Design a protein around this ligand. Structure first.
Ligand code: HEM
Ligand code: HEM
Lengths: 294, 103
């Protein structure tokens, strides 16, 4: 029949300016709804939503991924790995009604990019053209990674998304943002100090704080610092594996580099599984609220 | 402004990096006791960026409002990783609370 191929197809008569206005709506809602999750804001959950809709991809048969907007169906919606993302979905709801022409995949991925940018992270080039696919194309539950694992598991899992060591370390830096919630994932607590500003604090914290491995209220084991942070076992395994450890120290010493590699990795992530034709526009870099004067 | 609402804003948005009480521990950022009417970059025992010291400003309610609106804008090169209170109300409330909290 031939391998499954997903050709990027730009929304009819839409262009960069249109997508900037979607971005603006997302960013403005981010700025204004600042009470959510005890004043963390929606940023981190939008980033997590974009990663999760993307992280279902399987490079071997092109089954998962962002293209199909499949997060909009119950099977994928109620995936236990995805508990809590309904908040990001509901955030993005009024924006979808304002721009009904945008495909669901384009909207989710754009949510994540906007969040990373607004939170003073690096600029992330973004490509439009994802197309909504039928409910039977939705990936089965269980494609997202588990937290109670080691470095070997992490490296192996990321092979499926075509990510190498540097890309994995870079992407994991997103755990600078936000927190774990007990009712969502059986883990509880802030990953770091700046909850909604994108920094290299993940690396610095991993290396410089004093961590202890203990059981939380769900009887899950997590690493807690005396300074009040927490890390999942998968996070901490990035200092337990020598090759990972090198890269960790690298990003800890150089935020600029980390921003560059993260931008590359994140865009790759959001784009895995997508074939962009020749006629396709160049990737879009969107203007933050800040550089529009707000 | 509402000192109580300000107390909530501090607990959720500043406390992870600052304590307020006298002789309070330095954390991510410096202890903020006595902050108003003292020069920036002057907490004893704390290691500031040179940018914070170079800014050289006696902290008061207006400059505090400005800083907290956008800390990187008021002190470029600052290491305080904080987005900014973008609602004037919240700035007034926070500063009200901080006024008494750190006396
Ligand atoms: C081995 C890889 C990973 C594991 C095991 C993992 C696991 C988790 C878990 C269990 C949570 C808690 C969810 C909750 O309780 O609300 C979480 C939160 C989060 N994850 Fe990861 N994740 C991984 C990779 C990533 C990647 C690659 C990204 C982004 C590119 C990411 C972004 C986030 C963000 C931003 C949050 C905080 C969300 C919020 O505060 O609401 N994660 N992660
Ligand atoms: C509205 C919330 C906050 C307020 C009102 C606040 C208060 C202040 C004040 C008044 C200063 C100047 C201190 C001086 O010059 O002696 C300062 C600096 C600093 N704060 Fe914050 N803080 C807040 C949130 C945070 C957060 C979230 C972090 C870290 C994630 C942080 C970490 C720091 C650091 C590291 C400095 C020193 C900056 C430098 O030396 O360049 N603060 N803060």
């Amino acid at each position: 029949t031939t391998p499954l191929v997903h050709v990027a197809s730009v929304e009819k008569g839409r262009s960069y300016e249109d997508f900037q206005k979607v971005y603006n709506a997302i960013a403005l809602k981010l700025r204004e709804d600042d009470e959510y999750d005890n004043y963390i804001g929606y940023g981190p959950v939008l980033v997590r939503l974009a990663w999760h809709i993307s992280g279902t991809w399987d490079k071997h048969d092109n089954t998962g991924g962002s293209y199909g907007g499949t997060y909009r169906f119950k099977k994928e919606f109620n995936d236990p790995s995805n508990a809590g993302l309904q908040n990001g979905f509901k955030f993005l709801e009024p924006i979808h009604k304002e721009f009904p022409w945008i495909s669901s995949g384009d909207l989710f991925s754009l949510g994540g990019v906007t969040a990373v940018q607004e939170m003073q992270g690096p600029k992330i080039p973004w490509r439009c053209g994802r197309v909504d696919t039928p409910e039977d194309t939705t990936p089965d539950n269980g494609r997202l990674p588990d937290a109670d694992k080691d470095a070997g598991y992490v490296r192996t899992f990321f092979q499926r998304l075509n990510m190498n060591d540097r890309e994995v370390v870079a992407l994991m830096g997103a755990h600078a943002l936000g927190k774990t919630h007990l009712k969502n994932s059986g883990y509880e607590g802030p990953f770091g100090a700046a909850n909604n500003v994108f920094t290299n604090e993940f690396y610095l914290n991993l290396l410089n704080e004093d961590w202890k491995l203990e059981k939380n209220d769900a009887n899950n084991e997590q690493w807690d610092s005396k300074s009040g942070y927490m890390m999942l076992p998968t996070d901490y395994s990035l200092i337990q594996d020598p090759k990972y450890l090198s890269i960790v120290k690298e990003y800890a010493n150089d935020q600029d580099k980390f921003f560059k590699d993260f931008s590359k990795a994140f865009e790759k992530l959001l784009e895995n599984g997508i074939t962009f034709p020749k006629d396709a526009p160049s990737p879009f870099i969107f203007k933050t609220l800040e550089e529009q004067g707000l | 402004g509402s000192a109580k609402k300000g107390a909530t804003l501090f607990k959720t948005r500043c406390l992870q990096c600052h304590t307020v009480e006298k002789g309070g521990p330095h954390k991510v950022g410096p202890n903020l006791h006595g902050i108003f009417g003292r020069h920036s970059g002057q907490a004893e025992g704390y290691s500031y960026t040179d940018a914070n010291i170079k800014k050289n400003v006696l902290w008061d309610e207006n400059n505090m409002s400005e800083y907290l609106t956008n800390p990187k804008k008021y002190i470029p090169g600052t290491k305080m990783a904080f987005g900014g209170l973008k609602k004037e109300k919240d700035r007034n409330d926070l500063i009200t609370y901080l006024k008494k909290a750190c006396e």
